[PDB]
Ligand binder design. Structure first.
Ligand SMILES: NC(=O)c1ccc[n+]([C@@H]2O[C@H](COP(=O)([O-])OP(=O)(O)OC[C@H]3O[C@@H](n4cnc5c(N)ncnc54)[C@H](O)[C@@H]3O)[C@@H](O)[C@H]2O)c1
Ligand SMILES: NC(=O)c1ccc[n+]([C@@H]2O[C@H](COP(=O)([O-])OP(=O)(O)OC[C@H]3O[C@@H](n4cnc5c(N)ncnc54)[C@H](O)[C@@H]3O)[C@@H](O)[C@H]2O)c1
Lengths: 327, 327
């Protein structure tokens, strides 16, 4: 079939090093879907030369699905006619750098990339933001792209989701693939709330199976929330490969469909569950025909409302801090 | 179907960081083949802790095919009942380190790993050596495993093969997937000889298509031979991801079959083309039912004989240098 143009930022970085090869292999859009890769990196010579090196490796894999591949240093050419965009590039937090400094640095990246997408990308481009702060960066881009549909801007909560999945399987001794209806609410941060109240394994309640809510509060939630730190403490570096996998899972499920299965996607709130409209928030959704749908009717108990309130408040703090860059 | 046990050495290293996730995803043995991963690293705390970190990431990917995964610090437990083994771990060359020092350091690794495989692995295990010097390390392991069939010990020449494929496609402007009958002879080193004399594209001669043998000698051969250096000069680090891909290609084609297509595999010479028996050498082969077969009847012109003689001589120099460690 006709090739899809996939734009990827931060292409000479670690996450992309595990990501690009899997997209070219056809893991993201199907083994029958040819892809064109439009890679973006900062204008600096060092980053551009490294991006050249990565492209050399991609050619050396002889991928039958790779219909084309170009390098860019300008978001205006990188996002040209893009059908899908994975915004992985972002400004990390260094020494002496405060939170306000982090938010502004990233705001200035995403307002520009958002405007670029608005101007030259496909009119119905699917956007996924991986770069941190994911949810907030997705909000800035969305706000910076008035001509595109807001529902097309998403943030990745899939890594939190898969990490939660892993812990449940390890706890129940059941295969990770048998777990259903598990999901995560909120911000991709330690304040995320992995909700296991509706999760089932073979039609049996995971919550009742474990029958120890103390485990839920003092073990399950804190472990998933701090998993990234655990990996950095063990390997010395970030969790690049699992983050790349989660990104593939996100786009794959969004475009191809979950077949009734529930999943987690950071999407713009339509007001469901008392979440202010516009706020990019983790919600349980099902997908079909390239569209998502928020699972309605879930009960929100006291504990859940408190966790939701915490993750929501962190998001409102981030939004307040970049508000001046918008407009 | 019943899970296959795959043993992988150098598991906390770079090549494995791109390799492990793709094997677990089912790229190596099929989407219907469950796998058990038995990972090996040196006994050192730092390497073992990093290996623990990589395993955490693998769990966080929620791979339905991963039937199990264990970490080891002893080759005797790591190779236990292994159906397939990818020997990626090896001693790299440092400052002041001479060639004789490199050969001995690696000889001492591979004699031990070879004996271990001999003792505890499946009686028909498939072995692939990626660690450099690949061909020679494969020879040491094979020699160190008298109870196993010698044809089961191979070295990876697939990266040289795919790199040659890439250059031909770029030169002819034809899709990399349309190229047939291309292959590489010899040692996985700059002395390798990518032979394009029988390569075809749509039933048309690639050699006649290019019609410039000077390009072959002074451009094609030197570029493929030094491609690894070109990548290190661009990225600052080795070509981990393309090497990992080539390893998957190697095992995949060997186990699943090439369906008549020719490919390159570093195998023990049976004496074909005047190559001394026992020498692990790159040969054009076809595969079927988990077995390979050397393509016979190719013409070897003067130029080819000289290139073959050079790569062969380098291999004999390496063999002479480790001979004292065998027995
Ligand atoms: N959402 C999640 O689940 C999740 C998880 C882990 C990490 N992350 C985030 O993903 C992002 C990338 O992580 P990484 O480990 O690959 O980092 P990295 O530093 O290895 O790579 C980032 C790359 O982005 C590039 N870049 C910087 N500014 C850019 C710009 N404005 N345009 C295009 N490219 C740009 C950099 O030059 C760099 O090569 C980070 O912000 C990281 O914290 C997200
Ligand atoms: N054959 C090819 O096509 C090809 C191409 C490129 C590189 N290589 C080679 O592959 C090997 C690995 O490369 P890398 O970039 O992943 O290196 P790396 O240094 O990142 O990783 C090697 C890993 O092997 C481990 N190791 C060392 N000794 C070991 C042992 N005796 N048993 C088990 N594990 C051991 C190390 O601790 C390290 O974690 C090297 O020898 C490299 O030069 C082969």
């Amino acid at each position: 079939k006709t090739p899809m143009r996939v734009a990827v930022t931060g292409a000479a970085g670690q996450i992309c090093y595990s990501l690009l090869f899997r997209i070219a292999n056809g893991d993201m859009l199907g083994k029958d879907q040819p892809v064109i890769l439009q890679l973006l990196e900062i204008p600096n010579e060092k980053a551009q030369k490294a991006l050249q090196g990565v492209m050399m490796e991609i050619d050396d894999c002889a991928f039958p699905l790779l219909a084309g591949m170009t390098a860019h240093a300008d978001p205006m050419t990188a996002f040209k006619d893009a059908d899908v965009a994975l915004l992985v590039g972002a400004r990390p937090r260094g020494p002496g750098m405060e939170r306000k400094d982090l938010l502004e640095a990233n705001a200035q990246i995403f307002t520009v990339q958002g405007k670029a997408i608005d101007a030259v990308a496909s009119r119905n481009i699917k956007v996924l933001v991986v770069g941190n702060p994911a949810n907030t960066n997705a909000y800035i881009a969305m706000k910076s792209a008035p001509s595109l549909p807001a529902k097309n801007f998403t943030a990745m909560l899939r890594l939190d989701h898969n990490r939660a999945l892993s812990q449940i399987a390890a706890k129940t001794g059941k295969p990770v693939s048998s777990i259903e209806k598990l999901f995560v609410w909120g911000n991709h941060s330690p304040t995320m709330y992995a909700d296991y109240r509706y999760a089932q394994i073979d039609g049996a309640s995971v919550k009742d199976m474990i029958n120890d809510d103390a485990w839920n509060r003092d073990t399950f939630l804190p472990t998933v929330g701090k998993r990234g730190a655990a990996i950095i403490d063990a390997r010395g570096v970030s969790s690049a490969a699992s983050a790349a996998n989660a990104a593939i899972d996100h786009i794959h499920d969004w475009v191809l469909g979950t077949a009734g299965k529930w999943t987690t996607m950071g999407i713009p709130s339509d007001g469901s569950y008392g979440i202010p409209e516009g706020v990019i928030f983790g919600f349980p959704v099902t997908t079909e025909n390239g569209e998502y749908k928020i699972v309605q009717g879930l009960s929100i108990d006291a504990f859940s409302q408190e966790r939701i309130n915490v993750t929501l408040n962190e998001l409102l703090e981030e939004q307040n801090g970049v508000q001046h860059l918008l407009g």
